[PDB]
Amino acid sequence: PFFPPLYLGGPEITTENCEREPIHIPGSIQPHGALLTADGHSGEVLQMSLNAATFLGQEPTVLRGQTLAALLPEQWPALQAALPPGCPDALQYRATLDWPAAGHLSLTVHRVGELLILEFEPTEAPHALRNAMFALESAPNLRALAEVATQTVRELTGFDRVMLYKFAPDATGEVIAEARREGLHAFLGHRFPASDIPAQARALYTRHLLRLTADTRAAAVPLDPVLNPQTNAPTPLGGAVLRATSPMHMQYLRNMGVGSSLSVSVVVGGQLWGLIACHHQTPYVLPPDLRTTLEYLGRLLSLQVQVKEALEH
Amino acid sequence: DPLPFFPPLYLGGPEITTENCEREPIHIPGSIQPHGALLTADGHSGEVLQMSLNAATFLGQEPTVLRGQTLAALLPEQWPALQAALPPGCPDALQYRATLDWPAAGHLSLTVHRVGELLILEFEPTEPHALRNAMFALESAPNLRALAEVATQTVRELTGFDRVMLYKFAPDATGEVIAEARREGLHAFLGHRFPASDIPAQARALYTRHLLRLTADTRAAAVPLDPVLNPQTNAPTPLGGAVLRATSPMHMQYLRNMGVGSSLSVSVVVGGQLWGLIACHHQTPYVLPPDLRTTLEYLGRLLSLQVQVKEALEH
Ligand SMILES: *C/C=C1/C(=C/c2[nH]c(/C=C3[NH+]=C(/C=C4\NC(=O)C(C=C)=C4C)C(C)=C\3CCC(=O)O)c(CCC(=O)O)c2C)NC(=O)[C@H]1C
Ligand SMILES: C=CC1=C(C)/C(=C/C2=[NH+]C(=C\c3[nH]c(/C=C4\NC(=O)[C@@H](C)\C4=C/C)c(C)c3CCC(=O)O)/C(CCC(=O)O)=C2C)NC1=O
Numbered sequence: 001p002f003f004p005p006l007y008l009g010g011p012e013i014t015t016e017n018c019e020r021e022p023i024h025i026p027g028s029i030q031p032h033g034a035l036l037t038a039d040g041h042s043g044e045v046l047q048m049s050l051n052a053a054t055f056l057g058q059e060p061t062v063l064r065g066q067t068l069a070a071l072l073p074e075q076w077p078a079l080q081a082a083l084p085p086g087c088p089d090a091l092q093y094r095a096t097l098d099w100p101a102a103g104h105l106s107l108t109v110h111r112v113g114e115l116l117i118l119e120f121e122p123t124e125a126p127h128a129l130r131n132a133m134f135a136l137e138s139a140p141n142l143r144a145l146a147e148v149a150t151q152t153v154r155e156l157t158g159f160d161r162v163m164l165y166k167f168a169p170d171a172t173g174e175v176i177a178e179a180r181r182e183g184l185h186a187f188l189g190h191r192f193p194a195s196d197i198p199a200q201a202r203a204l205y206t207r208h209l210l211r212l213t214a215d216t217r218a219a220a221v222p223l224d225p226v227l228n229p230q231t232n233a234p235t236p237l238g239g240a241v242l243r244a245t246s247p248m249h250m251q252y253l254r255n256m257g258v259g260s261s262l263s264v265s266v267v268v269g270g271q272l273w274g275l276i277a278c279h280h281q282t283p284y285v286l287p288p289d290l291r292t293t294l295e296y297l298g299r300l301l302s303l304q305v306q307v308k309e310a311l312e313h
Numbered sequence: 314d315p316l317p318f319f320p321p322l323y324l325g326g327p328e329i330t331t332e333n334c335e336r337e338p339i340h341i342p343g344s345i346q347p348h349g350a351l352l353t354a355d356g357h358s359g360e361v362l363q364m365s366l367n368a369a370t371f372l373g374q375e376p377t378v379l380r381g382q383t384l385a386a387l388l389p390e391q392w393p394a395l396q397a398a399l400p401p402g403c404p405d406a407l408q409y410r411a412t413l414d415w416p417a418a419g420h421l422s423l424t425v426h427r428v429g430e431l432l433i434l435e436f437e438p439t440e441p442h443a444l445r446n447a448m449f450a451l452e453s454a455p456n457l458r459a460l461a462e463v464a465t466q467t468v469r470e471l472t473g474f475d476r477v478m479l480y481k482f483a484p485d486a487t488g489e490v491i492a493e494a495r496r497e498g499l500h501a502f503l504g505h506r507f508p509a510s511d512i513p514a515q516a517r518a519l520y521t522r523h524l525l526r527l528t529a530d531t532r533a534a535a536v537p538l539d540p541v542l543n544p545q546t547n548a549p550t551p552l553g554g555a556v557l558r559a560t561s562p563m564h565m566q567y568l569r570n571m572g573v574g575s576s577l578s579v580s581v582v583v584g585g586q587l588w589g590l591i592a593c594h595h596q597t598p599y600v601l602p603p604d605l606r607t608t609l610e611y612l613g614r615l616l617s618l619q620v621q622v623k624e625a626l627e628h
Contacts, residue, residue: 082446091453094442127410130607131398133614138407269625292445296611299448303618310584 002200005234007226013248019198023246024238028220030213032285033121033242035223036063037235040085040114043068043076047235048224055120057101064224068116072097075107083111089239090207094288096123106288112236115228119242123288128156133300142308146177149301153276154179156293157286159262161279163187167272170194171202176274196252204238205265206272209298210291212262213245215283216253220244241291253279260284262291264298268305276301315514321549323541329563335513339561340553343542344535346528348600349437349557352379353543353550356401356430359384359392363538363550365557371436373417376539384432388413391423399427405554406522410603412439422603428551431543435557437603443471444608451615457623461492464591464616469494471608472601474577474593478502481589485509486517488589511567519553520580521587525610527577528560530598531568535559556606568594575599577606579613583621591616 002022004010013021029035034055037047045063053060068076075095082093089112097105097120106123109116132152139145146164154162161184164177171194178188197205205211221244228235237243253261260280266273276298286294318338320326329337345351350371353363361380369376385392391411398409405428413421413436422439425432447467454460461479469477476499479492486509490502512520520526536559543550552558568576575595581588591613601609 082450088453090449092445092449094445096441126412130408130410130610133611134406134408135398138404270622292442295445296448299615299618303614306621307585 008234013246018195018248019200021198021200021246021248022234023201024204024236024243025234026220026237026244026246027226027234028222028244029237029240029242030215030244031218031221032214033119035120035240035242036118037223037228038068038116038118039230040083040111040116043070045071046115046225046229049221050224051221055102055105055122057099068118072107079109079116083109083116085111085114087111089236092239108241108288110239112239114230115235117235117237117240119240121242121288128152129293129296132156132297136297136300136304139304139308142305142312143177145301145304145308147179149276149297150177150179153278153294153297157278157290159278159284160184160281161187163277163279164266164274165263165277166274167202171197171199173197201246202272205263205275206267206270208239209265209267210241210262210295211243211245212241212260212286212291213250213253214260214285216250216259216261218283257281262286262294264294266298266301266305268302268309273302273305318515324549329561331510334510334563335515337513337515337561337563338549339515340519340551340558341549342535342552342559342561343549344537344559345552345555345557346530346559347533347536348529349435351436351538351555351557352434353538354384354432354434355545356427356432359432361387362431362544363540365536366539367536371418371421372415384434388423395425395432399425399432401427401430403427405551408554410607424556424603426554428554430545431550433550433552433555435555437557439603444611447471447612448615451612451619454619454623457620457627458492460616460619460623462494464612465492465494468591468593468609468612472593472605474575474599475499475596476502476594478592478594479581479589480578480592482517482587486512486514488512491589516561517587520578520590521582521585523554524580524582524613525556525578525606526558526560527556527575527601527606528565528568529575529600531560531565531574531576533598572596577601577609579609581613581616581620583617583624588617588620 003020005022005025007027029049034052035049038045092110095107097107099105104123106121108119135148139148150162161180163175166174166176173192175187175190258279259282262278264276319336321338321341323343345365350368351365354361409425411423415421420439422437424435450463454463465477475496477494478490480488481491489506493503573594574597577593579591
């Protein structure tokens with residue numbers, strides 16, 4: 001099972017008890033966005049990230065009482081329709097907000113049980129996706145498909161390194177294609193133990209298909225009532241991209257000289273086939289609309305991997 | 314019975330009846346729909362060879378002026394991008410798309426693909442989070458029926474089409490409407506089945522490779538290519554991969570008889586086989602702009618993935 005998180009008197013994570021860290025309930029988020037939780041019926045804001053005043057530009061104490069109906073008049077009905085009770089926690093709804101202080105904010109919402117998790121990130125105000133889609137489909141084999149995919153992602157994102165990381169039947173990883181800036185170590189062809197991506201991350205990654213660490217040296221921001229008032233229990237954050245990353249993985253990234261990391265799951269037949277895995281040497285917050293393009297490419301790659309492996313076999 | 318294509322009409326082939334439907338060479342009609350323009354050009358030199366008769370209206374140039382220049386001079390910034398994106402030997406299904414600022418006609422969408430040594434260039438006029446929200450809603454649909462309903466309603470909301478159907482093929486190629494979203498007052502096609510001939514075999518083969526086709530106005534006359542044959546080969550110009558390709562007159566007649574002014578469908582391909590179609594109707598003529606159509610092309614791919622996933626749970 002899982003050990004309690006640290007803020008509930010749980011043990012420190014070591015190389016011996018990796019697979020057991022409750023990565024989904026860290027009680028904190030990354031500092032390039034803000035997170036609120038709220039009651040699914042009343043719209044009452046229950047928890048907030050201690051940095052919410054920066055993004056929402058509103059006295060920090062004003063928000064805990066207010067309802068979403070007050071804070072977000074136009075969006076609160078849509079949220080109710082888009083995320084009905086009993087929907088999966090993988091279902092997400094997104095909108096762009098015109099906030100008085102912070103300008104354009106991207107808003108991403110999902111539902112876990114009776115709680116709505118709301119994520120706020122800055123955002124901006126063409127044919128590369130369509131051109132990439134046709135390029136992927138005309139790749140003649142799996143090897144060429146892998147190369148086109150990593151090159152395409154690098155061109156869209158500017159990431160210093162983009163890898164296609166494939167799991168073996170025992171969850172050993174292999175870098176089968178790589179696009180990278182000149183002057184980086186090549187990881188192409190190298191193989192890595194299964195425990196570098198432990199079983200509970202792999203399970204989580206089969207259900208929520210995008211995760212990132214925008215800055216491998218930034219401190220996490222705690223959620224208000226670390227615990228959910230509804231349940232007096234930790235708030236599930238595995239579907240929040242803003243969720244804090246495991247410190248173990250953050251140490252691993254720093255030792256690799258990586259300032260920013262992002263991966264997208266490739267899921268084939270209900271199983272985690274591999275990852276589009278990205279590195280940047282410096283910190284790098286990919287804006288939400290560009291992340292959506294990678295999310296689309298993830299689905300397209302999942303389709304094309306099946307198509308291609310049906311030709312191989 | 315399976316039989317090879319007739320020569321097209323302009324090469325003395327016979328007129329098409331309900332008796333020889335499957336033999337209509339629908340991929341080489343020698344003409345296009347009038348809401349865009351088409352050029353062909355030599356894949357290596359860029360010399361312009363054929364143009365639809367309306368190309369001057371769209372490009373604001375004399376035909377003899379257009380034909381007297383290479384793509385390198387006509388599209389100086391796009392020409393190197395075309396060469397890189399569509400290398401010799403590449404499949405005819407591969408498409409490259411760009412947007413041009415053209416003085417006489419505003420923003421034009423340029424779509425290009427390569428058939429052998431020929432580049433085919435299509436020009437059309439062109440002009441928030443709905444796609445992402447639809448992606449997640451499709452993946453969360455609990456079963457095939459819910460998936461089909463969300464897909465048809467989503468497409469109708471994005472396009473405004475009077476009728477959007479999910480049309481599924483049976484093993485004998487007959488078809489059935491298994492979900493539909495429709496304008497108030499329209500009668501239901503839900504549950505209705507149709508003979509295999511209504512989408513003949515050469516169409517089904519074509520639709521497994523080129524995943525979107527349309528008729529923007531089912532009464533509009535087609536616009537000939539000039540000259541009609543490819544000068545490289547003194548043979549017909551393959552247009553199966555061109556959305557501007559003229560529609561079979563047999564199918565246009567069928568649509569008119571049904572009261573349809575505009576028609577569009579997107580292939581759903583599963584395991585290399587044409588599983589079904591997102592099929593759309595409008596009572597009046599209706600031109601969907603190319604960037605909107607791209608959203609439908611993406612949904613066609615998502616739907617192919619999700620139909621596979623939903624049917625695996627059905628076993
Ligand atoms: C003599 C041959 C005939 C024939 C030819 C034909 N049909 C198509 C294409 C399509 N037919 C479709 C059929 C239907 N649309 C509907 O809405 C319904 C039912 C409610 C049916 C049965 C469809 C969907 C297509 C695809 C194109 C589109 O989406 O509009 C072609 C190929 C046309 C082309 O791509 O140029 C041809 C040659 N149809 C007949 O009925 C017989 C008489
Ligand atoms: C070049 C090779 C290469 C490799 C092999 C690689 C691995 C990799 N690990 C990932 C995640 C995690 N790893 C661990 C833990 C452990 N990792 C260890 O090494 C031991 C000490 C340990 C256990 C005690 C945990 C808890 C997580 C989940 C973090 C979270 O989601 O919060 C991810 C996905 C996230 C991303 O894309 O950045 C990747 C892609 N990334 C590379 O570039």
